[PDB]
Amino acid sequence: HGQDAVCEFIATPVSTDVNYFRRPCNPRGRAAGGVYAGDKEGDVTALMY
Amino acid sequence: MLADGFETDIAIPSGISRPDAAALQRCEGRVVFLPTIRRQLTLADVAHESFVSGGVSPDTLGLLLAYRRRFPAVITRVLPTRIVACPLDVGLTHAGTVNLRNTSPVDLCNGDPISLVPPVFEGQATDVRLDSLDLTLRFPVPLPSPLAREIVARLVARGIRDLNPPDLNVLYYNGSRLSLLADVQQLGPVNAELRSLVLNMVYSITEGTTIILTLIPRLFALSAQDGYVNALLQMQSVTREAAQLIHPEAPALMQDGERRLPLYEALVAWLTHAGQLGDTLALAPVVRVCTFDGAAVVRSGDMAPVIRYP
Amino acid sequence: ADGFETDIAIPSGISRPDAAALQRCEGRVVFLPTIRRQLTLADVAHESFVSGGVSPDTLGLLLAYRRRFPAVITRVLPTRIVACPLDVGLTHAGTVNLRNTSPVDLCNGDPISLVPPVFEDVRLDSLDLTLRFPVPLPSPLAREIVARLVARGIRDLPDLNVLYYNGSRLSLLALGPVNAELRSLVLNMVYSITEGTTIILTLIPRLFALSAQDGYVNALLQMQSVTREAAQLIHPEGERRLPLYEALVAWLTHAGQLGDTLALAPVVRVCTFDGAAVVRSGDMAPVIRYP
Amino acid sequence: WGKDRQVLRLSLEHAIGTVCHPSLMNVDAAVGGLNRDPVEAANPYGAYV
């Protein structure tokens, strides 16, 4: 049909809520930056970990 | 203070790379340590190279004693030939107002006194370099006065750990989490800080203090009843765990107790040594903030009106 | 000209008895949030100092007067209250009359600090606010009179009322609500000093245990000296640990908090010119700030 | 429903902050305040030991 897309596979726990996936979200468990980060030297990596 | 004030002039050497000239024009409001109140000096006198001690590069904790030996001054206007600054110990201007740009992570409020700290915090370590003149400029960070007394208390308590073969790095203010960058401290200036402590520590202990020590069982009984007394101990004080074990009691009777007041004499000696010690380690809070068009918050990276503090 | 004058506007609706008390209060000390030309009277009143919920006590009034800005009222128009701030407006004019609310007389050349009305009242009916004016008493008495009232509160858990200045009696006792208004200052004294006198006693485990009057001086002098021998004269060097070094910092901040409170800096000095040196109660005194 | 569609669980497991704090077990204003006015006595069968 066209170029064949490539799926990824990320190990996740079983008992998460499916309701996290019914809205747009990250495959990562935490929301990344850097739009979310404010005005501080640390915030962009501080959102991460 | 004179009728016109007193304005020093820091002359600029003629050899200037043009990007370093624009670097000086960003130093519109900073704080500059003068060694004297001479009217004409050089940039080599201001910069970090003359600001070193003999053969030894000073650390962060040792840089505080170098500050109080010198004269803090504020740059007013950058000229192409020289830099005009006004001292702070001298009466500052004709008008009584100076602008100060915040090279500080923390915003300012009205009325709060400003003391000033070396570049200590992580990430925001910013030193202007004049590479045509091979100079380095370390500029101090203006901060509110209870914050500066915290940072001195965090640094001095860190050096006492080094004489004893966790943790103390993290501060908080306005809900902001912030730590500070420090690796080593020279054993010289720590002893100068510590001897300045323990002499002022001892000179608060007078005959009335042992009478005050009998009220330690009263406070630990009173912290049961009012939460305002619970706002004292905080579980990290000695006196909560000291009251759990020691039951002291008063000496009796005092010599010439008719003529004298022992509780009064212990307080006045306490107010002149221990309550004074916030001035003795750092330098004095010479400057507070009075915005005229009333801005309750002076944001980080902006100027502010400035008026002396007694 | 170039003299700075704050203008305080009175909201209309003043009854004829209410304006007479405001006519009388000419030379008094009045605080304000920020230096500004025009300003309401709601920021002047004692109701503006509250945190709740809670009318502020003697400890908060000492903390507020650092952040508040002192000003002395000039002539009082029926339209507005014209007052000049002390810290910026006086550096050009130089001379401001000031009436004592203090019962203690004033000599020439004295430094004067401001004390909240703890030594011991104007309220307006129609405007629904209160006014509390601080007491302009001299600064060497100011470290004394505060410390006398603290010493009474420690006795709550000889005569402290004797204060004789420039040939005059004073009676601190004169009662009930003055003691409970001052209770918060008493507790921060004892918590500061006892935390002071445990940490010094833990770092030096034998201050009291050391021998009297001759070994203690020898322990004092080497500590008093300037020479390089400093740290080996001090330090004593599962199971729980005494958090001493954290208790250092919390005590130093609390001691550093009270340094700004109980300095009571000389804001005002009085220079009597063409008149008597002694300025008594209810008399306008000229004021010259530091140049 | 949150600001955007999100199924936000509010449990009473979440209610630690208002209950576990010791401000619930306070008497002082009640007994000290209800006994301002005098009140007559009922049968002292449960009250007495």
Sign of CA dihedral C256, C262, C267, C272: negative
Give backbone dihedrals phi and psi of C137, rounded to 5 degrees, phi first: -110, 155
In the three-class reduction of DSSP (H, G, I as helix; E, B as strand; rest coil), residue C176 is classed as: helix
Residue B87 and residue B71 in contact, taking contact as beta carbons nearer than 8 Å: yes
Question: Token pair of C41, please?
Answer: 């009277």
Query: Whole-angstrom Cα distance, residue D48 to residue C279?
Result: 71
Residue B146 and residue B137 in contact, taking contact as beta carbons nearer than 8 Å: no
A23 interface with D at CB cutoff 8 Å: yes
Query: What is the residue type of B238?
Result: V
Q: Name C138's bridge partners.
A: C112
Within chain C, where are the H helices? 16-24, 58-67, 90-93, 139-155, 176-181, 183-203, 215-224, 244-261
Chain centroid to Cα B141, Å, comes to 10
Residue B154 and residue B64 in contact, taking contact as beta carbons nearer than 8 Å: no
Q: Which residues contact A24 (CB under 8 A, 6 or more apart)?
A: none
Residue C86 and residue C269 in contact, taking contact as beta carbons nearer than 8 Å: no
Query: What is the residue type of C224?
Result: Q
Q: Which of B60, B47, B139 is nearest to B100 (CA)?
A: B139
Residue B130: count of CB within 10 angstroms of its CB? 22
C246 contacts B236? CB cut-off 8 A: yes
B204 contacts C194? CB cut-off 8 A: no
Question: Token pair of B20, please?
Answer: 């370093």
In angstroms, the separation between the Cα of residue C157 and the nearest Cα of chain B is 7
Q: Name C70's bridge partners.
A: C31
Chains A and C make contact, 3+ CB pairs within 8 Å? no
Backbone breaks in chain A (C–N > 2.5 Å) follow which residues? Answer: none
Question: Token pair of D6, please?
Answer: 């999100």
In angstroms, the separation between the Cα of residue B180 and the nearest Cα of chain A is 13
Q: Identify the closest residue of chain B to A41 by CA–CA distance.
A: B123
- Rg of chain A over Cα atoms, rounded to whole angstroms, equals 15
Experimental method of this PDB entry: cryo-EM
Query: Whole-angstrom Cα distance, residue B244 to residue B158?
Result: 28
Q: Identify the closest residue of chain A to D6 by CA–CA distance.
A: A23
* Structural resolution in Å: 4.3
What DSSP line would sit under chain B, residue for residue? --SS---EEEE--S---HHHHHHHHT-SS-EEEESS--SEEEHHHHSTTTTS-SS----STTHHHHHHTSEEEEEEEE-SSEEEEEESSS---SSS-EE----SSS-EETT-EEEEE-S-BSS----EEETTTTEEE---EEEEHHHHHHHHHHHHHHHHHTT-------EEETTEEE-B------HHHHHHHHHHHHHHHHTT--HHHHHHGGGHHHHHHHTTT-HHHHHHHTTTSHHHHHHTT---------TTTTT--HHHHHHHHHHHHTTTHHHHSS----EEE--SS--SEE-TT---EEEE--
A19 contacts D5? CB cut-off 8 A: no
| Mutation site, D6, D8, D10, interface A, largest A CB count within 10 A | D6
Chain A residues lying within 8 Å of B105, measured CB to CB? 40-41
Q: How far, in Å, are B28, C153, C169 from residue B75 at the CA level?
A: 6, 49, 52
Q: Identify the closest residue of chain B to A42 by CA–CA distance.
A: B123
Q: How far apart are the first and last CA of chain C?
A: 18
Query: What is the residue type of B310?
Result: P
A40 interface with B at CB cutoff 8 Å: yes
CB pairs under 8 A between B and C: 202
